[PDB]
Amino acid sequence: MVRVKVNDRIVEVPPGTSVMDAVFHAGYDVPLFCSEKHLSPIGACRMCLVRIGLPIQWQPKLAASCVTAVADGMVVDTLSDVVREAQAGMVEFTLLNHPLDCPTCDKGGACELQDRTVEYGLYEKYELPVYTRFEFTRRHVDKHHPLSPFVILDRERCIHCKRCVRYFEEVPGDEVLDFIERGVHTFIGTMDFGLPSGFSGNITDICPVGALLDLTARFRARNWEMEETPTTCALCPV
Amino acid sequence: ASSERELYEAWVELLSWMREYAQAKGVRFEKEADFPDFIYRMERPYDLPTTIMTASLSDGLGEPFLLADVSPRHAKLKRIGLRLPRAHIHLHAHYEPGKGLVTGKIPLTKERFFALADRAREALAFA
Amino acid sequence: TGPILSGLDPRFERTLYAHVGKEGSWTLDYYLRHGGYETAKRVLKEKTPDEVIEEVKRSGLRGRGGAGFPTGLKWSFMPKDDGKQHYLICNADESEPGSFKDRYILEDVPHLLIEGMILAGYAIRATVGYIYVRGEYRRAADRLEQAIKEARARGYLGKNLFGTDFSFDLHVHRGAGAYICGEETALMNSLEGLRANPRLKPPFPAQSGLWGKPTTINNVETLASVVPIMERGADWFAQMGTEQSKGMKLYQISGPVKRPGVYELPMGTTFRELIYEWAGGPLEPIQAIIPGGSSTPPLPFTEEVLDTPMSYEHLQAKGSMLGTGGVILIPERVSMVDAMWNLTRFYAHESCGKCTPCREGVAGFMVNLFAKIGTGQGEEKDVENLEALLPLIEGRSFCPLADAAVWPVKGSLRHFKDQYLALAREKRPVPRPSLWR
Amino acid sequence: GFFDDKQDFLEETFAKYPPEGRRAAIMPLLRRVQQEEGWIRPERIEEIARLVGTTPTEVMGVASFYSYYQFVPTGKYHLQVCATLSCKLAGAEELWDYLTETLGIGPGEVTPDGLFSVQKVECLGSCHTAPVIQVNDEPYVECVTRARLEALLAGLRAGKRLEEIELPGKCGHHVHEVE
Ligand SMILES: NC(=O)C1=CN([C@@H]2O[C@H](COP(=O)(O)OP(=O)(O)OC[C@H]3O[C@@H](n4cnc5c(N)ncnc54)[C@H](O)[C@@H]3O)[C@@H](O)[C@H]2O)C=CC1
Ligand SMILES: Cc1cc2nc3c(=O)[nH]c(=O)nc-3n(C[C@H](O)[C@H](O)[C@H](O)COP(=O)(O)O)c2cc1C
Ligand code: SF4
Ligand code: SF4
Ligand code: SF4
Ligand code: FES
Ligand code: FES
Ligand SMILES: [Ca+2]
Ligand SMILES: [Mg+2]
Ligand SMILES: [Mg+2]
Ligand SMILES: [Mg+2]
C-alpha cells in the first residue's frame, strides 16, 4: 500500500488508485464532471486538477486527479489559491455557453453543474462582485427533442462530459449516441433513431445536467418535491 | 445605433419566411427557445417585436436541418445566425444602413434564403 | 575551416532537398541511378537493429516534428523481442501554418522516405509501416502511392528484402481536413476509424499505440534524415549545428520576402542568413517574426533577433521555440492584434471539442475577445480580460493544442501591448491595407 | 447500395488493415463516395456502417469531424480558399470578398449554374506561393492573383479540365520569386 498525504491528512491506499479517489478517501474534495463510477476515467472536463509534489518538489503544471496514479510519498494540494483560482475558472468556462433555463429545467436541484458552480465558482480574489465575464451571444441550437418515447435530449444544456457516449460503448455495448462536428460546434446525436439498446434509460441518471432526461416523467414535480422510496424491482429474478 | 432596433425588425421577417416555407413545403417549424431577457424581465420594460430567440426547421423525426438565432437584447456583437446542423455550415448576417440584411456583403433576401433551406431540406432531412 | 558547420560554409552538403525540383526526381529509376536503395541494402545485411539505433542516437538527431525529442532515445523505447507485431508511422499530415517543408519530400523524392522507413522499421522490428498524409496534399498522395507501387515491383518492399529475413511493406492513409490529426496520439485514432481526439498520453505509443501494438511515430523530415545518417555516419551529421542542435534542417519562410520557400541549412545558421542571403530580404518594413511554427511565440524584428542561431536552445532562451522551421515575417502595415486575431480564430476552428478550456475557452471566449477589440468596440477591460484568460487555459488543457493558441497571444501582449490598448482606447478597428495583387 | 458496384475497391482497401481494424476503412470509403458523388448522403453512411461493421451513429460522428467531407450538394468545382495568416498577408481576405461578391455566394449555396461552390479553408501547406486555392481535390492553384483568379474562373466556366488551363504569370516550386 502507498502512503499518500492529501491536504494535511495522510492516507493509506492500494497502488492502483486515482489521485481523485485518493483525495475523496481522505475527506477533502474537488469539482467533478466527466468522471463517473464504473465508467473509464478520463481527463476531459479538466476540473479535478490538483497540485502535486513528489519530494518538496512540486510539479510545474496542474494534474487531473482522475487519471493520475498515486506514487508513494506523494503530496496533493487542493486548497491553494492556485487551485481554487483554476477551479473557479473551470466553472466559468463551462457556464460560458450554458442556456439559462434553471427554473424551467427538469434537472431541478439535482444538477451536478448547478451544485458544483456554487461550490467552487466565483473566486474570491483578495467592490461589486462580477457574476458573469462572458458577454456575447450564447450557443443556441436544437432544444427539447425526444430521442425515444422514453428520452428527451437538450443539446444546449450538454456540457460535453463524455459520460453517455462513453457509457454506451462500455456498459451495454450499443454505440447509439456519439458526438458530431468538432470544436465549439459539437453536439450529441444519433443515427439509430429508436435508441435501440435495452439499457438506454441509464444515461438519464449519469448525465450531470439536463440534456438527457427521463421523458416518462417530464414536468411532474421538482426534484426535492419527490417522496423517494428505496425499494427493489420485482419484475424479474435479478 | 438604431441598427439594433432594425435588426430585430428583420429577425421577425426571417421568422416569417421560415413559417411560410414550413407550411408551403409542409415541414415542421419549431420555436426552439424564448429570450431569457423576457421571461426574467420582471417589471422591467420590453419592446422587441417578438419573444423567440431560437427558431428551427425540423423534419419528420424532429431533427433540425436549419437553425436560426439572434443575439439577446443586452448582448455584445449582435448578429443573427443561420446554421445547417450536420453539415458544418454557419452564417453571420448583420444589418447595413441603407443596404439591408447582409451576409458580409451579399444581400440575404427571401429568394436567397429559400435556396439555402431547400438545398438543406433535400440533402440533410432524415425522414 | 577549423571547427563547426553553421551556415554558408563551403563544406556543407545538401542531402535531403538535394534532388527536389529536378526533372523526374521521383522515378524509381532516378532514385536508383543518383544513389539508389544502396544504403538500406548495406545496413540490412551488416548492422543489427540495436546497432542502427546507436548510429542514429550518436548522431544527435531530434524529432523534426517540431517537438525536438531525441529520435534515437525514442526508438530506444520500443520493446526488443516480445513476439508482437510492431508498427512504424510516418506523420505526413503537415498542417502547421507557415510550415510546408514535408510536402516536397513526398512530391519529389518519395523513395528517400521509403528508404528511411525501411531503415527505421528494421531498427524497431516493425514489419508494417503507415503513412498518414493530409487529404489536401494530392500530388504528394499520388507520388507517394506511385513509389510504394514500384518499390514492391523490384522487391524493395516485400517478404524478404535483400535476401535478409526482414519484411517491410507500406500503407498510405489520406486525411480529410483536420490540424488535430497531426498530434501523434490522435493521429492513431483517426486512422483507426475513430473521431480524432488525442488519447491519454501517460501510456506512450511505444507500449501501446496503433491497435494497441507497440508503435512509433515520426515526422517526414525526421525519417528522411535517417538515410544520410546511415549512409555517411553519425560524425558527418554531428559536424553541423550547435552544442545541442545537431544536423541540418529544412527551414521554410513565408510572408513578404524577396523569394519565399524551403531552404536546407545547417542547424544553427542565423535568421539574418535565412531572411537575407537566401530569402532575399523583406519587401515591406517588418515588425515581428514567427520563428518556428505558428505555435511559436513571435519575436520583434530587431538586430539582436536577426543574429540569433535558429536552434532548439537559442530560441528556447529567447522566449520562444524552434517549431518546424516555418518562419513568417509580419509587416508593420498590419496590426499584431489582427495577426493573432487570425491565428486564434484558427486554433478555434481546429480544436477537437474534448476539453472545456480549449473548446469553450479559446473557441468561445478568446476568439470573441479579439473580435470585439478588433472592431473598435473594446474597452481597456477587454484587454485585461483576454490577458488574465491565458493562465486559466495554458497550463492545463488536455493536449498542447490549447497551449499553442495562448503561447503566441501571451508573447504578442508581452511585446506589442501598445497596439492592443491603442485599438481599445481609440475605439479603432484594425487597419485594412490592400495586400493582394 | 453504392459499393455493390465495386467490391474490388473493398477487397483492396480492407486489405491495408488488420482483421480487428475494419473501422480504419471508414475514412478511405467516405473519401471515395465524395470524389464520386460530390457529397455524403445519409444512406451512404448507413451503408458504410454495415461494411465496416459498426453502427450508423458511430460512422456519422466520425464522418462529421473532418472538413473535407461535404454533407450537402456542392458545385461542379467547389473552390476552397485558404484563409490563414500567410495567405492573409497575401490578400486572402480580398480574394474571398472578390470571389464571394462576383459569384454572389457564401458557404451552403451553389451558383445558379450548378458549377461554383465556395468555402474557406485553413493553411493548405504552400504559403510561399500565396494566396492559395484548392479546386476539388486536384493539385492546388497557387499564386491566385486577381489576374490569375479570373483566368481560373473563365477556364472552368468554359469547360476546360483544370489540369490544363493556361494561367498568366509564373509560379515557383518549393521556392518562389516575387517582383
Ligand atoms: N510539423 C508540423 O506540422 C507541426 C508540428 N507541431 C509541433 O508539435 C510540437 C509538440 O508536439 P508533442 O508530440 O505533443 O510534444 P511532447 O511534449 O508530447 O513530446 C513529443 C515527443 O516526445 C516523446 N516523449 C516525451 N516524453 C516521453 C517518455 N517519458 N517516454 C517516451 N516518449 C516520450 C513523444 O513520444 C513524442 O515523440 C510543437 O512544438 C509543435 O511545434 C505542432 C503542430 C504542427
Ligand atoms: C496539437 C499538435 C499538432 C501536431 N501536428 C503535427 C503535424 O501536423 N505534423 C507533424 O509531423 N507533427 C505534428 N505534431 C507533433 C506530432 O506529435 C509529431 O509529428 C511526432 O511527434 C513526430 O515525431 P518526431 O518528433 O520524431 O518528428 C503535432 C503535435 C501536437 C501536440
Ligand atoms: S442543466 Fe443544471 S445548470 Fe443548466 S439549466 Fe438545468 S439545472 Fe440549471
Ligand atoms: S448529454 Fe449529458 S452525459 Fe451526454 S456528454 Fe452531454 S452532459 Fe455528458
Ligand atoms: S486542448 Fe483542444 S484540441 Fe486539444 S484535446 Fe483539448 S479540446 Fe481537443
Ligand atoms: S473529472 Fe477529472 S477531468 Fe473531468
Ligand atoms: S497559410 Fe495559406 S497555405 Fe499556409
Ligand atoms: Ca426538434
Ligand atoms: Mg419538442
Ligand atoms: Mg543527374
Ligand atoms: Mg478548414
Q: Domains plus CATH for chain D?
A: 1-73 (1.10.10.1590), 74-179 (3.40.30.10)
Distance, CA of D64 to chain centre? 15
Which residues in D4-131 belong to E strands, given as ranges? 77-82, 116-121
> How far apart, in whole angstroms, are the C-alpha atoms of residue C386 and residue C409?
9
Instruction: Indicate yes or no: CB of D72 within 8 angstroms of CB of B90.
Output: no
Ligand 5 atom at shortest distance from the alpha carbon of C359: 7
Tell me the β-bridge partners of C87: C128, C215
Q: Residue C87: which residues within 8 A CB-CB, separation 6 or more?
A: C126, C128, C129, C130, C209, C210, C211, C213, C214, C215, C216
The order of strands in the sheet holding C286-290 is C261-266, C248-254, C326-331, C286-290, C299-300
> How far apart, in whole angstroms, are the C-alpha atoms of residue D128 and residue D19?
43
> How far apart, in whole angstroms, are the C-alpha atoms of residue C66 and residue C290?
14
Q: What are phi and psi of A165, to 5 degrees?
A: -55, -45
Q: Residue D87: which residues within 8 A CB-CB, separation 6 or more?
A: D123, D124, D127, D130, D131, D132
All three cell numbers of B22: 414550413
> How far apart, in whole angstroms, are the C-alpha atoms of residue A4 and residue A19?
9
Domains, chain C, in order of start with CATH, read: 1-60 (6.10.250.1450), 61-239 (3.40.50.11540), 240-334 (3.10.20.600), 335-437 (1.20.1440.230)
**CB of D130 closer than 6 angstroms to any ligand 7 atom:** yes
**CB of C96 closer than 6 angstroms to any ligand 1 atom:** yes
Q: Which residues of C are annotated as a binding site for FMN?
A: 74, 91-95, 179-184, 217-219
**CB of A166 closer than 6 angstroms to any ligand 4 atom:** no
> How far apart, in whole angstroms, are the C-alpha atoms of residue D53 and residue D43?
15
Computed on alpha carbons and rounded to an integer, the radius of gyration of chain B in Å comes to 15
All three cell numbers of D171: 509560379
Amino acid letter, C412? S
All three cell numbers of C378: 473594446
> How far apart, in whole angstroms, are the C-alpha atoms of residue A98 and residue A140?
9
Residue of A35, A45, A46 best to disrupt the C interface, most CBs of C under 10 A: A46
3-class DSSP state of C281: coil
**CB of D125 closer than 6 angstroms to any ligand 7 atom:** yes
D-facing residues of A in 124-183 (CB < 8 A) are 174-182
Amino acid letter, C290? I
Q: How far is CA A50 from CA B25, B116, C155, C356, in A?
A: 56, 49, 55, 16
All three cell numbers of B97: 444602413
Q: What is the DSSP letter of C362?
A: I
Ligand 2 atom at shortest distance from the alpha carbon of C185: 17
Task: Tally the residues of chain B.
Answer: 127
Q: What is the DSSP letter of C178?
A: -
Pairing of strands A2-5, A10-13: antiparallel
> How far apart, in whole angstroms, are the C-alpha atoms of residue D160 and residue D166?
10
Give yes or no for a contact between A154 and A143, defined as CB atoms under 8 angstroms apart: yes
CA dihedral B61, B63, B66, B71 (to 10 degrees): 130
Chains in contact with chain B (at least 3 beta-carbon pairs closer than 8 A):
A, C, D
Amino acid letter, B87? A
Give yes or no for a contact between A190 and A147, defined as CB atoms under 8 angstroms apart: yes
Is the alpha carbon torsion for B82, B125, B63, C193 positive or negative?
negative
**CB of D136 closer than 6 angstroms to any ligand 7 atom:** no
Cβ of A166: how many Cβ atoms within 10 Å? Answer: 21
Resolution in A: 3.1
Kindly report the nearest CA distance between residue C195 and chain D, in angstroms. 5
Breakpoints of chain A, after residues (C–N > 2.5 Å): 55, 126
- Protein residue with its CA nearest to atom 3 in ligand 3: A114
All three cell numbers of D62: 466520425
Task: List chain C residues with CB under 8 Å of A86.
Answer: 392, 395-396
Count of alpha carbons within 13 angstroms of residue C341, beta-carbon side: 22
Give yes or no for a contact between B95 and B10, defined as CB atoms under 8 angstroms apart: yes
Task: List chain B residues with CB under 8 Å of A195.
Answer: none
Q: Which H or E element spans position B68?
A: strand B64-70
Domains, chain B, in order of start with CATH, read: 1-127 (3.30.920.80)
> How far apart, in whole angstroms, are the C-alpha atoms of residue D158 and residue C345?
36
> How far apart, in whole angstroms, are the C-alpha atoms of residue C297 and residue C407?
6
Instruction: Indicate yes or no: CB of B76 within 8 angstroms of CB of C375.
Output: no
> How far apart, in whole angstroms, are the C-alpha atoms of residue A36 and residue A114?
17
**Helix (H), strand (E) counts: chain A:** 5, 10
Helix axes C336-350, C401-425, angle to 10 degrees: 140
Which residues in chain A belong to E strands, given as ranges? 2-5, 10-13, 49-53, 63-64, 75-77, 145-146, 151-153, 178-179, 188-189, 212-214
Q: Residue D29: which residues within 8 A CB-CB, separation 6 or more?
A: D3, D13, D48, D51, D52
Q: What are phi and psi of A15, to 5 degrees?
A: -55, -45
> How far apart, in whole angstroms, are the C-alpha atoms of residue B104 and residue B79?
11
Cβ of C270: how many Cβ atoms within 10 Å? Answer: 19
All three cell numbers of B94: 448583420
Instruction: Indicate yes or no: CB of A140 within 8 angstroms of CB of B56.
Output: no
3-class DSSP state of B83: strand
Q: How far is CA C78 from CA B34, B91, C116, C127, C210, in A?
A: 58, 48, 18, 13, 13
Tell me the β-bridge partners of C251: C263
Nearest to C91 by CA among C198, C184, C204: C184
Residue A176: which of D42, D45, D55 has the nearest Cβ? Answer: D55
Q: What is the DSSP letter of C359?
A: I
Instruction: State the alpha helices, DSSP H only, in C217-311.
Output: 220-231, 233-238, 271-272, 303-306
Q: Residue A76: which residues within 8 A CB-CB, separation 6 or more?
A: A4, A5, A6, A7, A19, A22, A23, A50, A51, A52, A65
Give yes or no for a contact between B36 and B44, defined as CB atoms under 8 angstroms apart: no
Pairing of strands A75-77, A63-64: unpaired
> How far apart, in whole angstroms, are the C-alpha atoms of residue D84 and residue D68?
17
All three cell numbers of D107: 458557404
Count of alpha carbons within 13 angstroms of residue B122, beta-carbon side: 10
Pairing of strands A49-53, A63-64: antiparallel
**CB of A43 closer than 6 angstroms to any ligand 6 atom:** yes
Q: What is the DSSP letter of A157?
A: T
Chains in contact with chain C (at least 3 beta-carbon pairs closer than 8 A):
A, B, D
Instruction: Indicate yes or no: CB of A136 within 8 angstroms of CB of B75.
Output: yes
Tell me the β-bridge partners of C328: C254, C290
Q: Which residue of A has its CA nearest to B125?
A: A191
Q: Which H or E element spans position B97?
A: none
> How far apart, in whole angstroms, are the C-alpha atoms of residue D125 and residue D156?
24
> How far apart, in whole angstroms, are the C-alpha atoms of residue C161 and residue C41?
8
> How far apart, in whole angstroms, are the C-alpha atoms of residue A78 and residue A87?
10
Kindly report the nearest CA distance between residue B118 and chain A, in angstroms. 19
**Helix (H), strand (E) counts: chain D:** 7, 4
Give yes or no for a contact between C351 and C311, defined as CB atoms under 8 angstroms apart: no
Instruction: Indicate yes or no: CB of D100 within 8 angstroms of CB of B124.
Output: no
Which three-class secondary structure string do you get for A172-188?
CCCCCCEECCCHHHCCE
All three cell numbers of C398: 488536455
Q: What are phi and psi of B58, to 5 degrees?
A: -100, 170
> How far apart, in whole angstroms, are the C-alpha atoms of residue D2 and residue B121?
22
Give yes or no for a contact between B66 and B56, defined as CB atoms under 8 angstroms apart: yes
Nearest to C295 by CA among C16, C26, C28, C66: C66
Give yes or no for a contact between C430 and C423, defined as CB atoms under 8 angstroms apart: yes
Task: List chain C residues with CB under 8 Å of D131.
Answer: 436
Q: How far is CA C168 from CA C89, C118, C119, C125, C160, in A?
A: 13, 7, 10, 10, 8
> How far apart, in whole angstroms, are the C-alpha atoms of residue B56 and residue C170?
48
Resolved by: X-ray
Pairing of strands C169-173, B106-107: unpaired
